[PDB]
Swiss-Prot record:
A motif (BH1) lies at residues 93-112. Keywords: Apoptosis, Autophagy, Chromosomal rearrangement, Cytoplasm, Disease variant, Endoplasmic reticulum, Membrane, Mitochondrion, Mitochondrion outer membrane, Nucleus, Phosphoprotein, Proto-oncogene, Transmembrane, Transmembrane helix, Ubl conjugation. One of its GO terms (molecular function) is channel inhibitor activity. PROSITE patterns: BCL2_FAMILY, BH1, BH2, BH3, BH4_1, BH4_2. This is Apoptosis regulator Bcl-2. Residues 49-64 are annotated as: Required for interaction with SEPTIN4 isoform ARTS. Required XIAP-mediated ubiquitination and apoptosis. Suppresses apoptosis in a variety of cell systems including factor-dependent lymphohematopoietic and neural cells. Regulates cell death by controlling the mitochondrial membrane permeability. Appears to function in a feedback loop system with caspases. Inhibits caspase activity either by preventing the release of cytochrome c from the mitochondria and/or by binding to the apoptosis-activating factor (APAF-1). Also acts as an inhibitor of autophagy: interacts with BECN1 and AMBRA1 during non-starvation conditions and inhibits their autophagy function. NCBIfam families: bcl-2. The lineage of its organism: Eukaryota, Metazoa, Chordata, Craniata, Vertebrata. One of its GO terms (biological process) is protein polyubiquitination. A motif (BH3) lies at residues 50-64. It is linked to A chromosomal aberration involving BCL2 has been found in chronic lymphatic leukemia. Translocation t(14;18)(q32;q21) with immunoglobulin gene regions. BCL2 mutations found in non-Hodgkin lymphomas carrying the chromosomal translocation could be attributed to the Ig somatic hypermutation mechanism resulting in nucleotide transitions. The gene is BCL2. A motif (BH2) lies at residues 144-159.
Amino acid sequence: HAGRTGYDNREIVMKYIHYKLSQRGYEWDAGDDVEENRTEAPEGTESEVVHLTLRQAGDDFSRRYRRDFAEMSSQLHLTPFTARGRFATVVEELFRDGVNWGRIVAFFEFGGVMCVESVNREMSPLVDNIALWMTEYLNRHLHTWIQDNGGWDAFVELYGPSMR
Ligand SMILES: O=C(NS(=O)(=O)c1ccc(NCCSc2ccccc2)c([N+](=O)[O-])c1)c1ccc(-c2ccc3sc(CCc4ccccc4)nc3c2)cc1
């Protein structure tokens, strides 16, 4: 009794972040389990529509705010110990009062911003860790907000591309 797409907070973040790194050409060792996993074929026209919307959603945002999160990035600093604690401290501010499709878009960007921050130095593997925490906060907050507010289909339906 919950759609038939199987959207996974982990997968969505893994794809979005995976694309961000692709732009640079970094073969992010995401699917460490590279043993040919079919299960039910890669075909996912269902979650495919939102994959583009969500993927493009962040891009359009980053282009609008090119002097907000970029600066705060310097505050994050560079370290594996504080990195994990800094993430939660940042997201916490993303939604002080309440959550909304409008604010969540910034959520994805954050991960990508902090993710690349590690790659810039020499902590590519860390990119995987970030995604782990991202899904936690997204599933522990957003998920509940989206699930109660229609769901994923809402975002894509509300913010749908031209025609299709
Ligand atoms: O305007 C906003 N939302 S909206 O009006 O409801 C909207 C407007 C357009 C679209 N879509 C249009 C097509 S693409 C697009 C998507 C989103 C926004 C703009 C365009 C969408 N949406 O798709 O959900 C939502 C909006 C504006 C500003 C912020 C915002 C501002 C300062 C900060 S600081 C921070 C720390 C986390 C943090 C750290 C690092 C980086 C980011 C955030 N996060 C912030 C987030 C957050 C949301």
